[PDB]
Design a protein around this ligand. Sequence first.
Ligand SMILES: OC[C@@H]1NCC=C[C@H]1O
Ligand SMILES: [Zn+2]
Length: 1000
Amino acid sequence: CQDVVQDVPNVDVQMLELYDRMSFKDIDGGVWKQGWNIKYDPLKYNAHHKLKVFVVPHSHNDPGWIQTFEEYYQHDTKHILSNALRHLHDNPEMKFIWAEISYFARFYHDLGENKKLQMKSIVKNGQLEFVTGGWVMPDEANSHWRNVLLQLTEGQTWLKQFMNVTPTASWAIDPFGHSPTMPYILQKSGFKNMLIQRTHYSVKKELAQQRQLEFLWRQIWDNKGDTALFTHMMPFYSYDIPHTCGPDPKVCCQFDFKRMGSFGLSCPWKVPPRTISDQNVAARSDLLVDQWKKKAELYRTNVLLIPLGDDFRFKQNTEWDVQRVNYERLFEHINSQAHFNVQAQFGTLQEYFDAVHQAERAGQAEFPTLSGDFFTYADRSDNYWSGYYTSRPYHKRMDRVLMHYVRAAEMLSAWHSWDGMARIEERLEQARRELSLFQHHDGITGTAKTHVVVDYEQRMQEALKACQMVMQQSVYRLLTKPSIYSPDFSFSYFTLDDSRWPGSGVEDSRTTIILGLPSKHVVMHNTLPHWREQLVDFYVSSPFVSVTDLANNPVEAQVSPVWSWHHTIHPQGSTTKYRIIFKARVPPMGLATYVLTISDSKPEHTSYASNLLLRPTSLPLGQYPEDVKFGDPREISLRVGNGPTLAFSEQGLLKSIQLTQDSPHVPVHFKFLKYGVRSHGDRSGAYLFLPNGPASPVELGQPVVLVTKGKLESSVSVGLPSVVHQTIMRGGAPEIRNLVDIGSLDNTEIVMRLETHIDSGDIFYTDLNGLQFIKRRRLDKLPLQANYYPIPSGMFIEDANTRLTLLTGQPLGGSSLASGELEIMQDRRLASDDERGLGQGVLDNKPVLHIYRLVLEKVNNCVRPSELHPAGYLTSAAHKASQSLLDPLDKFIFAENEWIGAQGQFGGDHPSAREDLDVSVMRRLTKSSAKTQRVGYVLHRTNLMQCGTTQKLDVCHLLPNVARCERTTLTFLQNLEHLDGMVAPEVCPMETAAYVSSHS
Ligand SMILES: OC[C@@H]1NCC=C[C@H]1O
Ligand SMILES: [Zn+2]
């Protein structure tokens, strides 16, 4: 295993370094506004050395944006694919590439048999070529790597099953900036090439100048380079025809033949396209070939990629005709005229990449190496696209909930074969597909029209219900004696209980366990492959409850009141229901059963939290044994167990953390601020963050502070404008919860900021797709919005001695705008459109419960990478805190009065793997009729910082009667290695591997 800490990789282009050097000057470069006047030597190409040009027709199909998936399917995409089937069938030299398998599967299953066979034949002969073959073209900023893999697997599994093809070339023309997580997953899924478009105009210019727009993209930690994936960056402003023929859109627009008469479209540069004739073909070819030869100067081979398409193009029969016939006339003239020294034809993306690598192996070119990312994107001037890192934060949070629910449903149901009557495979397919669809670059991004967001939400709501049904049927089968297990596959044996989605302040939909019915069975699931202990809570009808395991051993517990906030923002207690809080111990990938039992009076093993209200009136709590205390606002300090001591201001916001008894009170201040929108010039919208100066403090007033002090759990909640802010303490890193209701504060963005004396300077770390931490440098030469980066799961600052890490349960935008600071946007409400085509601002805000862990640590005794290393790594504590947010224990309440044949535990004999190893995916790949059953596992090993302080996991033996163990691509679709003694080796730090076990 490569060291990923001490050795820095050697790359030609390191994007953090490039950022340090680049001036980012927004110079007017002429007809190529963000470039220069390209020159070429006409003697460069001759009859020996010709320019080979591939014109690659395409149609950008958004699975939701202005319309819903179904609306676009019915009114646009259905007609595009029908016309493609017909026109490619009838025109054997014509070509077309297709990216979104969500739409293609929708279309193919509607076809009659005749058309299905016609479709298979134009795919088999390479006319219609799938590019990437994901369910969608995902967002790369907010998307979790697990969901990027999920949506890739959904699409390619469909393509393999139905078209017998697996794409090896990726096409990503629309995501708003690009992540190295994509080459990471693609290269481990059999890919050989990828293409990207939306990078910063200054980066296009800088790389174009060095012919570095094609590069071997490797991970920031990868010394050896085996992660490398060949990447083509397109050089110009857009993927549309005006910005794909060459540097001058006024010329290129004349070669988009849909922009003439009968179609009702036009060229903004005022020169229309003309039909190619014998009279004008020499003149028109002169202009077009000159554009091609200019574009070719930016690349290292004599093979040129010319995309030909735009948003939902190739819809009409007549569009196919006018583009095809005019280009054929141009090709026929250009190829016949030796003076051009060009061979031009319709081609596909893999045809382009194959020809580029042939040129490379002929000795024509050697490609530069590159590491880093392409955030934050700007398309023009100061228009940085950091807005969508936060836009529609409710659905951003919902994404991470559904991610966990799909993993837990696939894992819990994987243990057994199910009868088709159970509809397990149907429910899991539905859940995978709705979560996969939401990875779209107008889904999780929050860049779709209000009604489309509603469609996404309802699809994810149904996916969540499907996951619950699979999980509760699985738990019933796993913990019921086989002698009794007699399933009704339509019955609810358990109801799920989820404290954090949507949150009791958002949807007051937790079931109260009603005891009098004296006892109630609850079950916890642990999707992680190590033993876990975690506090769990349930709502109960009475404060007089005690906890046992199934063997009747008592379990220490705490009872707190149920609290809700009301607009003055004041708490009110429940007289009716109470929280029972206790520590569940759950095996790796297993289940643990506990029992809640009522009694006459205070039980022996259950304690009662005190409650202090700081502002008064009086708050009855019914049967709750301890009266609520009142006091004037004052500073307060709390410690739970052996854990940190936290001090809070009189506004109830953190001000210091003391790690240990004999350690300093380290300053750590939470503050809420607000950004506005410009009165003059460009307005913030769903995409763009265009602040009118630094954030100004929120006016807190004199707020009400509720302090709940318990043996197992304490918390400080405060009712601020737009935010009920809560700090919860269970004995380790505190948990922060913000109930964010931006209400009708138009043109406002609410930020949460941490202020410390950590001497971070201009350095900070943010993650990419929950997979890796990348070093960021704040640049005062760039505007504030350019220093905003995606925070998909975490961010940290460190000096030589001290680190602060903020872990998130949701992707939000964030930065460190000054030494010692972290900040992260909570929500944003924008009255205006930002002119990228969405045609609305963001005024559909709803209450969302944002969750975090705050980890203050000493790192002076940690082995940290070189100061030249472009990566950072979490500690054990920060990693486990992330895992607690993204993959908590699942909680199940037995629905019925009696559970005959209940068992106490499943998975007690499961191996407890090292803390840096995860079973990201467990998925049964076969239905019950397969005589050979197959189960797929994805194994991810992270890299933790070593600071001073388990059984081997062989996934192929987790199930019995194992006949074969194969290492596969991450999609499970290609066998890479038949494994020795059917033992799945453990993987290197920052490596992800997939394995399929086969069983008798
Ligand atoms: O995905 C549809 C849109 N294409 C142009 C710009 C941004 C995207 O939302
Ligand atoms: Zn798009």
